[PDB]
Amino acid sequence: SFELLHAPATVCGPKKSTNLVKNKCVNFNFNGLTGTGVLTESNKKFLPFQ
């Protein structure tokens, strides 16, 4: 039984990570969160749990 939640992954598949590119359009995957766009520093004050 799996919980497909937005919460931090507790179980990950046997996958390898890459480095970040930034300031370029990229196809990204963050813990299963996927999409295409430009990654930049947000300078946003996220709470410690977000």
Place this chain on the structure above:
Amino acid sequence: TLVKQLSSNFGAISSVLNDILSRLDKPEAEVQIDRLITGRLQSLQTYVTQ
């Protein structure tokens, strides 16, 4: 309204096309995707008519 409808999930397992495609195989995803296409097309037609 037009934008919010994108997250409606019109009977599909998910409102996100990427999550359906990244989770189900072809013959299964096509069904879930078609549900979203019908709902989104109907939502867009409603917008244009108005």
